[PDB]
Design a protein. Structure first.
Lengths: 93, 93
């Protein structure tokens, strides 16, 4: 089954960004992710990001990816995020 | 002992760019390169380049890399270029 995604990308610079994100959120070490709308998500990288091929509602094909960050609360609230939404990633330690 | 380079970078966006170029410039691969001065060089990647730490004239440390391209008919004479000058890398030529 084809995998859908709200947004996809194919520009080299864009790819460059996504691949750099997979590298930082690679040492699976606690982080504080900031997204486009200004949202701030902190926690542990529970499911690492992996770039994959997707299609959007307009049927365009491109790259994107998802990672799951479990919050720092007692019941570790799970939150899946799309990589294109990320504008920065700073430690937590 | 410090190695000196004309320019060096510390911002994650420029490091992300520098790293993606390596991925597209594997050892011995034939490519055509777009440079930020409007020029373009084509040939064979002599050896896979690496991103390293250098010092500029003001003695500040940062990242950058050196690329060597060789050929035959093009222009002869091997050429060395600093990678921060690259704007695009396409395969086949």
């Amino acid at each position: 089954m084809p995998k859908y995604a709200p947004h996809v990308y194919t520009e080299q610079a864009q790819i460059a960004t996504l691949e750099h994100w997979v590298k930082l959120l690679d040492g699976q070490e606690r982080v504080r992710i900031e997204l486009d709308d200004g949202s701030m998500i902190a926690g542990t990288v529970a499911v690492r990001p992996t770039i994959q091929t997707y299609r959007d509602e307009q049927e365009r094909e491109g790259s994107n990816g998802q990672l799951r960050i479990d919050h720092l609360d007692a019941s570790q609230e799970p939150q899946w995020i799309w990589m294109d939404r990320i504008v920065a990633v700073h430690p937590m330690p």
